[PDB]
Nucleic acid binder design. Structure first.
Ligand SMILES: [Mg+2]
Ligand SMILES: [Mg+2]
Ligand SMILES: [Mg+2]
Ligand SMILES: [Mg+2]
Ligand SMILES: [Mg+2]
Ligand SMILES: [Mg+2]
Ligand SMILES: [Mg+2]
Ligand SMILES: [Mg+2]
Lengths: 15, 91, 181, 127, 95, 283, 214
RNA sequence: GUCGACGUACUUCAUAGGAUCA
RNA sequence: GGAACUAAUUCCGUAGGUGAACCUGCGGAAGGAUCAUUAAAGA
RNA sequence: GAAGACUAACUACUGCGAAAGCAUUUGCCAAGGACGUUUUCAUUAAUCAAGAACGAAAGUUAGGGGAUCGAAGAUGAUCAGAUACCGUCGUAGUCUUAACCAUAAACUAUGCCGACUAGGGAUCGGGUGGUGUUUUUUUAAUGACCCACUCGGCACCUUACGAGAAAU
C-alpha cells in the first residue's frame, strides 16, 4: 500500500 | 444387392433406443395384423421351472437395490419384464 | 428463327426418360409447336424451333426448362407444370454450402431433411406449394420465387441442426401467413 | 449476316447483372443490373426485376447492331453457391423472348480445386 | 340428430380389397418390412412383398396387409396377384 | 424475466446492506416488490428505477394505505439513460445484460454510493472477485479492483427462481474507494486493453502487434506536437524510436517478461509510470 | 454527354488457316484518334469460339478455342491460336461414380519454340461381360497409363510446329493413339485432352502469321 | 468474513403396473 | 423577459469473454427421424 | 502478375497405419502386412508394475510467413416477433522450422493372446485350376473379365442349438 501511494504521487507529476 | 447392402449398413449403425423402440412397436403392430395350447403349456412349464421374469434376476435386483428404478423409464422396462412373465404364467 | 437447344441426360434419369417418353413428346410437339429429337449417340435431348409453325418465341426456352426439370429429378407431372405456367423456377444448393458436414454427420443431415417415410420432406412441400427432390447431397426446389424462399429457409434450418418438430411448428405458422395472402 | 455478342448474367443473391459485351470480352455495350429497375431494395434479386433488366438490355443492344448473343450465366461461385438461382434464369427467359437470337448457352461458375475457407465458422452461416 | 344407415353387410379383411381394386377405391404404399415380412425378388422386375392397402384417396385409412405379388410394367410395380401367408412363406423359402 | 421466489434469500440480501435509518436507497429493477418493502421499513426514502409500467403500476398499488406510502419514488425509462439523483446505497436485481454497464456507471458517479448489494451471474461475479494469478483474472477484474473492492456474500443457486434458469447466481457487495485514486481512467484502461489481449502470453508480446505500434506512434507524435518539439529521423515511420523506447522500459522495470495475467496492480502502476516517464500515453 | 457508340468502329475477326469457317465475327474498338491510335488497342484480345461454329461440325459442340489477335489490316484483324478447352458441362457429365479417373499433364516445347502445357483425361470401363459393378484400376496400372500418356504427348507435340499440332487436335488423332497404345494394360474408355494452354510465346516472326492466312 | 476448493456427516426429489367392477 | 394583434437439438476437449438469466473461436461425437432415381462403352 | 493456404467432382466410412491419422504428379530414401514355399533356427513364447517412443484441435517459448477464415476488441442496428438475433473492420491464431504441453464423446460409450460353435451373397489383397470371353500377330503371352477353390482383412443378410430385461 505504501509503494502504491508513492507511485501515484509520481504519476501526479506527469499528467 | 448393393443398394440393399448400403441401406442395411447405414441402419446397422443407428443404435438409439427410441429409434429402435419405435421400429419395434410398429413392427409388432404389423406382425399382429398381417400374420395350440400345447406350445403354451410347454412355455408355461419352462417359465415355472425357471422363474426368469422376477426381480431376483441380476439386472432387476441391481436396479431395485440401488434406487435406480424410481426414475420412471427404467421402471417402464422393469414393469414390461414383469408383465411379459405374467403373460407366460397365465393359463 | 430456326433455333435449338440440346440438354444432356445423366444416366440415372435415362431409364425413366425412355420409360416415360410417350407422355413427353406430345405436349412438346402440338401444344408448343416444337420439333423434338432425342440423340442416343450422345445421350441428350435436342430441341429445335422450326420457323414455320411456331408462334410464341418463349416456346424454345419453355421446353428446355421442362426437360431440364425432368432431368434434375422431378417427376413428369411436376415438370409439365413447369411447361404450362409462367412463374416457376428451380433453386439448387448443397449441404456443404450451408455447413461443412461430412462422414456420418452428412447422412444424418439428409435423414433429418427427408424424415421417416418421407414425412418431413412432404410437410415442407405441402405447406409451401413447392416440390423438393433431394439428390445425393444436392437439394433441388421447384416453385414460385417467394415459396421457394420459404422452403429454402426451412430446409436450411434443418441442415444446421434444429430438430424436426420445431420445423413442423414453424411450418404451419408459415402456412397460415401464406394462405391468407 | 448476323452480328454476335455475349451476354454475361451474374446471378447473385442480392442482384442480377445482365452485361452484354462483344466476343472479345473487353468492350462492353450494355450493362444493367437488377438494382436499377426497382427502387425498393426488398427485391433487387426478384425475378421481376431481372425481367425488366433483360428487356432494357435487349432493347439497347438491338439499337446498336447486335442481333444475336451467346449467354454465359454464372452464380457467385468461389466458396459460396455454384448454381444460378432464379434471378439468372428469369433474365435468361426474358432475354430469349426478345427477338435476339440465342446460341450456345453455357455456365461458367468458378469452381475450386479445393480452396480457402468459407465465411461463417464451424456452425454454418445462414438460417 | 341420429343418423340412419339402412341396409348393411359386414366384412373385415381380404374381400374388401379384392373388390376395392376394381376402381380407384384403393391404392397401396411402399412394401413393408421387418422379420417375416421381407420382400423377396424373383427377378429384377418381379417380386413378392407384404403391402398395406390404402383406401381413402383425400382423408382416409388403411386395411390389413397382404402378400401381394407384383411386376413392373413401364416403370411401376404394378400389383398382380394376392398371395396368402403360407404361399408367401414357401416363395420366400425358395430364395 | 425471472423471479426470485425464495423468501429467505431476500431478507438476507436486505440486511447485509446495513441500511441506516438515514439512507437513500437506489433500488434498481425492483420487480414486483418482493424485496422492496423491507427497504421501505429500513430506509428514509427509496428511489426505485423501473422500465415496465405494468410493474410500476402494480408496485405503487402495493404501498397504498401502508404507512410507507410516501417514501418511494419511481423513475421510469432505461436505466442506462437516466440521470440518477444522489443515492446512498444501491440494491440491484436487474436482468443480467446490464451487469457490466451498471458497475462502471456506479464507479463513475459523481459522489458514488457507499455500499451496493448486487446480483450477478456466477461466472461474472467470479471474474470480479478473482485475485492476480487465478485462472479468471481478466481485464474486468483489474479495472474494478482498481476503483472498488468486491466481496462475495453467498451463492444463490438456480432453483430459487421462477422459471429456473440455467446459470447460477451470486450476491456480491461492492464498495467504492473513497477518494477514488488519482491515476487517470483512460490511461489505465488503455494500458489494460493492450496488455490483456492475450492473457497468458508475456507482456512484451502485446507490444509487438502492428496495430499497437501504430497507435503508440500516433500518440507519441501527438504528444510532441502538443508540446511543439519537432521530430527526428525515423528509419521506418516514427515507431522506430518508440520501438527501442518500449524495449528500454521492458528492460528496466523488468516487466517485459512476466505474463500479464499474473501481475498485480502495483506492477501495472510501475509500467504506467515508466511509459509516462519516457513520453508515451494511451489516450 | 457522350453516347459512346457514335465513335466506335467495327472490325472483324478472321480465324487462322487451319479451320474451315475462316470468318468469325465483329468487334468494337474506338475511332483511331491520333494520340491513342486504335491498332495498339486491338493487339492483345482473346476470343472464344466453339469450334463447331468454326468447323461446321456438331460433335465439336464442346471444345472451345481461344484465338488471339496479333495483326491488323484494313478492318481485318488476323488471329492465332491461344489455347483450347472443354465446356464445363461435358466435363461435369463424364465424371461418374464407380469408376476411376486418370489424369495427366505435361510441359512441352514445340518446333517453333512455343512452350505449352497440355492436359489429358481418361476413365476406366467395364469390359463387356463384366458383372461386378465398379472396375477401378489397381494404381500400379494407373502409373503405367500415366507414363504412357505422358510419353505419347511429349513425343507427339515436339515433332510438330504449332499448326501441325493444331490440326492434329481437330480430328482427335491423339485420342486414337492413346487408345491403341493403352489397351493391353487396362480397358480405359473416354480418352480426351481437355485443355491446352500456352506459357511462352517465343518472339513474333510475322512470316508464320502471314503464312497462315496467305 | 452469513468467503472459496475440498474432506467427513446428513437430508430430500423421483413408484406404480395390469384385470374386473362403477 | 414583457405587453400584445391576428390564426388553427444434446454434448466432449481447449482458448477466451466489459449490453454475460450466457456468448464465441477450433477439432471431435450421436447418446440425432433415409424419401425418390439408379447398366446408359445399353460398341 | 504477385502471395499464402488448400488439394473439390472421382470418393466407396471401401484402402493403409499401434493409435492420433493419411487424398495433385514425379523421383529418392528406408520400412510394412497378407500370400507363396518339400528354406532356416528350435521354444526363442503370451500378458505386463518400473521405464520408454508417438499422441487431433486448442495452448506457451524463439525465428519466418501472414492469402483466407477468425477467440478478444471496436463499431452499425437495436425495426412488435427475431419465428428469419445478425452486419463491417479485425489483434492472437490458422501455415512453418526448433523446443514445450500430453489432453478429447482419444467411441465399438465394448482389454490383449489361444480354442471351439451355421448358413449365404458380395468386396479388397495373394495364390491354384480352367481346350471359358475379349485384348490378335497370324495362333500365341501377359493384361482385363467369367467361373470354381483357398488363406488373410473391413463390413452385410438369415436363423439360433445359444445369450439377454430388452435393444440387440
Ligand atoms: Mg507405465
Ligand atoms: Mg498440435
Ligand atoms: Mg498451433
Ligand atoms: Mg510467432
Ligand atoms: Mg473479415
Ligand atoms: Mg513427449
Ligand atoms: Mg476419432
Ligand atoms: Mg480419459
Amino acid at each position: 500500500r505504501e509503494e502504491r501511494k508513492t507511485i501515484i504521487g509520481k504519476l501526479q507529476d506527469y499528467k | 444387392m448393393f443398394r440393399e447392402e448400403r441401406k442395411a449398413r447405414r441402419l446397422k449403425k443407428i443404435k438409439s433406443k427410441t429409434y429402435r423402440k419405435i421400429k419395434k412397436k410398429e413392427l409388432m403392430k404389423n406382425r399382429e395384423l398381417a400374420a395350440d395350447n400345447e406350445d403354451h403349456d410347454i412355455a408355461r412349464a419352462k417359465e415355472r421351472m425357471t422363474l426368469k421374469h422376477k426381480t431376483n434376476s441380476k439386472w432387476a435386483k441391481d436396479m431395485i437395490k440401488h434406487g435406480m428404478t424410481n426414475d420412471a423409464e427404467t421402471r417402464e422396462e422393469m414393469e414390461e419384464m414383469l408383465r411379459q412373465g405374467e403373460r407366460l404364467k397365465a393359463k | 428463327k430456326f433455333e435449338s437447344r440440346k440438354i444432356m441426360v445423366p444416366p440415372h434419369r435415362m431409364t425413366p426418360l425412355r420409360n416415360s417418353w410417350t407422355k413427353i413428346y406430345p405436349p412438346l410437339v402440338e401444344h408448343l409447336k416444337l420439333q423434338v429429337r432425342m440423340n442416343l449417340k450422345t445421350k441428350s435431348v435436342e430441341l429445335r424451333t422450326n420457323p414455320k409453325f411456331t408462334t410464341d418465341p418463349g416456346a424454345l426456352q419453355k421446353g428446355a426448362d421442362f426437360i431440364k426439370a425432368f432431368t434434375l429429378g422431378f417427376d413428369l407431372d411436376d415438370s409439365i407444370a413447369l411447361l404450362r405456367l409462367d412463374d416457376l423456377y428451380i433453386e439448387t444448393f448443397e449441404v456443404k454450402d450451408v455447413k461443412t458436414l461430412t462422414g456420418d454427420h452428412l447422412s444424418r443431415a439428409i435423414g433429418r431433411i427427408a424424415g421417416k417415410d418421407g414425412k418431413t420432406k412432404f410437410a415442407i412441400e405441402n405447406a409451401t406449394r413447392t416440390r423438393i427432390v433431394l439428390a445425393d447431397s444436392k437439394i433441388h426446389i421447384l416453385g414460385g420465387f417467394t415459396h421457394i424462399r420459404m422452403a429454402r429457409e426451412s430446409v436450411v434450418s434443418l441442415i444446421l441442426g434444429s430438430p424436426p418438430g420445431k420445423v413442423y411448428g414453424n411450418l404451419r405458422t408459415v402456412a397460415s401467413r401464406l394462405k391468407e395472402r | 449476316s448476323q452480328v454476335f455478342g455475349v451476354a454475361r448474367i451474374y446471378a447473385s443473391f442480392n442482384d442480377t447483372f445482365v452485361h452484354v459485351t462483344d466476343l472479345s470480352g473487353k468492350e462492353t455495350i450494355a450493362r444493367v443490373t437488377g438494382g436499377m429497375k426497382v427502387k425498393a431494395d426488398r427485391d433487387e434479386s426478384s425475378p421481376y426485376a431481372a425481367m425488366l433488366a433483360a428487356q432494357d438490355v435487349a432493347a439497347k443492344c438491338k439499337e446498336v447492331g447486335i442481333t444475336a448473343v451467346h449467354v454465359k450465366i454464372r452464380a457467385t461461385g468461389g466458396t459460396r453457391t455454384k448454381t444460378p438461382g432464379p434471378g439468372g434464369q428469369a433474365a435468361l427467359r426474358a432475354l430469349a423472348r426478345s427477338g435476339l437470337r440465342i446460341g450456345r448457352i453455357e455456365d461458367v461458375t468458378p469452381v475450386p480445386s479445393d480452396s480457402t475457407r468459407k465465411k461463417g465458422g464451424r456452425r454454418g452461416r445462414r438460417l | 340428430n341420429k343418423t340412419r344407415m339402412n341396409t348393411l353387410c359386414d366384412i373385415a379383411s381380404t374381400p374388401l380389397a379384392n373388390i376395392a381394386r376394381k376402381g380407384l377405391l384403393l391404392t397401396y404404399s411402399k412394401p413393408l418390412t421387418g422379420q417375416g415380412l421381407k420382400t423377396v425378388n424373383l427377378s429384377p422386375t418381379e417380386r413378392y412383398c407384404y403391402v398395406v392397402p390404402r383406401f381413402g384417396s383425400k382423408i382416409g385409412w388403411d386395411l390389413n396387409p397382404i402378400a401381394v405379388h407384383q411386376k413392373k410394367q413401364k416403370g411401376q410395380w404394378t400389383v398382380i396377384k394376392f398371395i396368402t401367408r403360407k404361399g408367401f412363406q414357401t416363395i420366400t423359402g425358395e430364395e | 424475466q425471472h423471479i426470485l421466489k425464495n423468501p429467505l434469500v431476500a431478507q438476507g440480501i436486505v440486511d447485509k446492506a446495513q441500511i441506516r435509518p438515514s439512507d437513500v436507497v437506489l433500488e434498481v429493477g425492483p420487480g414486483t416488490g418482493n424485496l422492496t418493502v423491507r427497504i421501505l421499513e429500513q430506509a428514509k426514502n427509496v428511489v426505485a428505477v423501473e422500465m415496465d409500467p405494468r410493474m410500476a403500476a402494480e408496485l405503487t398499488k402495493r404501498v397504498r394505505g401502508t404507512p410507507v406510502e410516501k417514501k418511494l419514488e419511481i423513475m421510469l425509462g432505461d436505466f442506462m439513460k437516466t440521470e440518477l439523483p444522489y443515492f446512498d446505497i444501491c440494491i440491484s436485481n436487474t436482468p443480467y445484460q446490464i451487469s457490466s454497464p451498471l458497475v462502471f456507471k456506479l464507479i463513475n458517479q459523481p459522489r458514488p454510493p457507499r455500499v451496493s448489494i448486487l446480483m450477478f451471474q456466477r461466472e461474472f461475479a467470479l471474474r470480479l472477485l478473482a485475485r492476480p494469478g487465478d485462472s479468471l483474472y481478466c481485464r474486468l477484474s483489474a479495472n474494478v479492483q482498481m476503483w472498488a473492492n468486491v466481496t462475495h456474500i453467498m451463492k444463490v443457486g438456480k432453483n430459487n427462481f421462477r422459471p429456473p434458469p440455467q446459470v447460477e447466481s451470486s450476491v456480491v457487495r461492492l464498495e467504492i474507494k473513497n477518494p477514488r485514486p488519482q491515476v487517470d481512467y483512460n490511461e489505465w484502461d488503455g494500458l489494460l486493453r493492450i496488455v490483456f489481449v492475450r492473457k497468458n502470453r508475456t507482456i512484451s508480446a502485446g507490444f509487438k502487434s502492428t496495430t499497437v505500434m501504430d497507435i503508440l506512434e500516433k500518440n507519441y507524435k501527438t504528444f510532441l506536437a502538443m508540446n511543439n518539439e519537432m521530430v527526428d529521423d525515423t528509419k521506418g515511420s516514427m515507431h522506430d524510436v518508440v520501438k527501442e523506447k518500449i524495449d528500454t522500459v521492458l528492460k528496466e522495470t523488468d516487466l517485459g517478461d512476466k505474463r500479464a495475467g499474473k501481475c498485480d496492480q502495483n506492477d501495472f502502476l510501475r509500467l504506467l509510470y515508466a511509459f509516462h516517464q519516457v513520453g508515451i500515453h494511451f489516450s | 454527354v457522350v453516347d459512346p457508340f457514335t465513335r466506335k468502329e467495327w472490325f472483324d475477326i478472321k480465324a487462322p488457316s487451319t479451320f474451315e469457317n475462316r470468318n468469325v465475327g465483329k468487334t468494337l474498338v474506338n475511332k483511331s484518334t491520333g494520340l491513342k491510335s486504335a491498332s495498339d488497342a486491338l493487339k492483345g484480345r482473346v476470343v472464344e469460339v466453339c469450334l463447331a461454329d468454326l468447323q461446321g461440325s456438331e460433335d465439336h459442340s464442346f471444345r472451345k478455342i481461344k484465338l488471339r489477335v496479333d495483326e491488323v489490316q484494313g478492318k481485318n484483324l488476323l488471329t492465332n491460336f491461344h489455347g483450347m478447352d472443354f465446356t464445363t458441362d461435358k466435363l461435369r457429365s463424364m465424371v461418374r461414380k464407380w469408376q476411376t479417373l486418370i489424369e495427366a499433364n505435361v510441359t512441352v516445347k514445340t518446333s517453333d519454340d512455343y512452350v505449352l502445357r497440355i492436359f489429358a483425361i481418361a476413365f476406366t470401363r467395364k469390359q463387356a461381360n463384366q458383372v461386378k459393378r465398379h472396375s477401378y484400376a489397381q494404381s500400379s496400372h494407373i502409373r503405367a497409363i500415366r507414363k504412357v500418356i505422358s510419353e505419347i504427348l511429349t513425343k507427339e507435340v515436339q515433332g510438330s510446329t504449332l499448326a501441325q499440332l493444331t490440326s492434329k487436335l481437330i480430328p482427335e488423332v491423339i485420342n486414337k493413339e492413346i487408345e491403341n497404345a493403352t489397351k493391353d494394360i487396362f480397358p480405359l474408355q473416354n480418352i480426351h485432352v481437355r485443355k491446352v494452354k500456352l506459357l511462352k510465346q517465343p518472339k513474333f516472326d510475322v512470316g508464320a502469321l502471314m503464312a497462315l492466312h496467305g
